[PDB]
Amino acid sequence: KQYIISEELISEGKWVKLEKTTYMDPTGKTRTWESVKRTTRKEQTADGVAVIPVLQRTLHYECIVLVKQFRPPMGGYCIEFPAGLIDDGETPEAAALRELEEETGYKGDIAECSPAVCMDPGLSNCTIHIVTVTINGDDAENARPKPKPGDGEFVEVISLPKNDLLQRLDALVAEEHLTVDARVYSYALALKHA
Amino acid sequence: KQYIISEELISEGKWVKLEKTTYMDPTGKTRTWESVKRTTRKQTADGVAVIPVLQRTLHYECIVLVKQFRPPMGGYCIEFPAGLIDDGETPEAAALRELEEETGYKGDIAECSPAVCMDPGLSNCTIHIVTVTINGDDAENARPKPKPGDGEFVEVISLPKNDLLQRLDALVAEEHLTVDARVYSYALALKHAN
Numbered sequence: 568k569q570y571i572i573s574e575e576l577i578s579e580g581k582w583v584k585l586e587k588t589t590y591m592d593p594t595g596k597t598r599t600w601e602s603v604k605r606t607t608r609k610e611q612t613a614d615g616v617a618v619i620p621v622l623q624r625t626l627h628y629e630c631i632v633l634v635k636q637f638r639p640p641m642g643g644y645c646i647e648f649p650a651g652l653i654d655d656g657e658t659p660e661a662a663a664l665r666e667l668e669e670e671t672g673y674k675g676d677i678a679e680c681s682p683a684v685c686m687d688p689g690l691s692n693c694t695i696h697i698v699t700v701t702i703n704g705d706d707a708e709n710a711r712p713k714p715k716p717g718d719g720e721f722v723e724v725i726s727l728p729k730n731d732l733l734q735r736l737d738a739l740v741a742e743e744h745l746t747v748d749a750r751v752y753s754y755a756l757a758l759k760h761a
Numbered sequence: 762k763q764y765i766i767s768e769e770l771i772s773e774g775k776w777v778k779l780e781k782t783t784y785m786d787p788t789g790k791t792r793t794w795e796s797v798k799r800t801t802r803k804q805t806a807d808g809v810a811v812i813p814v815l816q817r818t819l820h821y822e823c824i825v826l827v828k829q830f831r832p833p834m835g836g837y838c839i840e841f842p843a844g845l846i847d848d849g850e851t852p853e854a855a856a857l858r859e860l861e862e863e864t865g866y867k868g869d870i871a872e873c874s875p876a877v878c879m880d881p882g883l884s885n886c887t888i889h890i891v892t893v894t895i896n897g898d899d900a901e902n903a904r905p906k907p908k909p910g911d912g913e914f915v916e917v918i919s920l921p922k923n924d925l926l927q928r929l930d931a932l933v934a935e936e937h938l939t940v941d942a943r944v945y946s947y948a949l950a951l952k953h954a955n
């Protein structure tokens with residue numbers, strides 16, 4: 568029975584805006600919320616994609632391909648799934664394969680594509696598709712993969728065995744100042760709990 | 762190689778602020794980033810999210826989730842039980858408290874993540890992911906009494922761990938909900954561990 572009554576702009580940047588949201592609570596009382604949104608969403612089913620890249624090689628354990636980047640909002644290096652915003656007119660699947668090749672150099676194959684999932688729904692309206700992609704690491708195209716970083720993109724590739732992912736993330740967190748992304752950590756936890 | 766030079770306040774609300782981050786890019790070039798932060802961090806992290814494993818003998822193991830209207834999203838979301846850590850509260854104690862308030866369940870800590878980032882391209886927000894087991898056969902968890910704070914309105918949805926991804930896909934298909942990216946990520950890995 569809850570719904571939005573109004574969205575009032577508080578502050579609009581080039582990339583991010585702050586809104587005062589007025590909504591109806593389930594007792595029938597109007598309340599407000601401070602809401603973050605991006606300015607970059609057009610007709611896309613979501614802001615962005617994140618790629619779960621499963622690197623497959625004969626006589627290797629499967630790896631999960633991760634990226635390490637400086638994230639200004641965090642003031643530090645973060646370990647994440649490869650990810651980027653969806654270009655206007657682009658499918659989530661094309662954005663996923665394109666961002667994976669740009670950030671890691673790998674040419675993947677689509678396996679599955681999530682519905683739009685919320686990044687931090689108490690804070691923002693931001694959504695992604697989580698796109699699972701396999702990388703045939705036996706293909707010559709995926710032998711010596713070179714990232715194609717865009718202007719101001721600076722990405723390090725970290726491939727960790729699926730069968731030990733959580734302990735290998737713990738060992739990287741123990742060795743330096745860096746944050747693991749919550750989606751990566753949730754995925755590594757589930758691999759342990761299965 | 763990369764670091765924060767300065768931060769410029771653009772807009773402060775009660776709960777969230779918008780900053781302009783100046784940072785040194787690895788080439789020796791200074792760059793700007795629009796960054797969101799909470800105003801509420803004093804703590805290991807802003808928040809906890811609880812992975813609650815409901816264990817009842819002769820039943821499938823369930824993951825306990827919550828459905829809430831999220832004003833930034835303009836709709837209903839399915840999430841791990843979660844809230845901000847009170848000043849002076851440990852992440853573990855915040856986890857058991859949030860789980861009790863949102864679900865009525867009384868659980869035991871299994872493990873606690875380090876601080877992990879929610880959306881590091883947009884925000885500095887971090888959480889501890891806290892794995893909790895719930896002895897569902899215990900009297901105290903027979904008729905679980907959820908204690909919602911002012912303006913909290915939370916539905917409990919328990920889904921079998923062994924079919925979690927298909928069950929979440931079903932809810933999105935029929936109920937027009939948004940699944941949280943950490944919940945979806947956990948559900949994917951449970952399928953991918955095979």
Ligand SMILES: CSc1nc(C(F)(F)F)cc(=O)n1C
Nearest residue numbers: 599600601689690776777799
């Ligand atoms: C933790 S309560 C709250 N948090 C936020 C935000 F997440 F954006 F920081 C905005 C808001 O309006 N409230 C009531």
Ligand SMILES: CSc1nc(C(F)(F)F)cc(=O)n1C
Nearest residue numbers: 582583605793794795882883
């Ligand atoms: C996707 S590029 C970008 N995104 C953001 C934000 F994520 F906050 F929306 C801010 C910013 O300055 N840039 C360059």
Ligand SMILES: [Cl-]
Nearest residue numbers: 760814871892
């Ligand atoms: Cl467990």
Ligand SMILES: [Mg+2]
Nearest residue numbers: 649650651670
């Ligand atoms: Mg990216």
Ligand SMILES: [Mg+2]
Nearest residue numbers: 650651666669
């Ligand atoms: Mg990119």
Ligand SMILES: [Mg+2]
Nearest residue numbers: 842843844863
């Ligand atoms: Mg909550």
Ligand SMILES: [Mg+2]
Nearest residue numbers: 843844859862
């Ligand atoms: Mg709460």
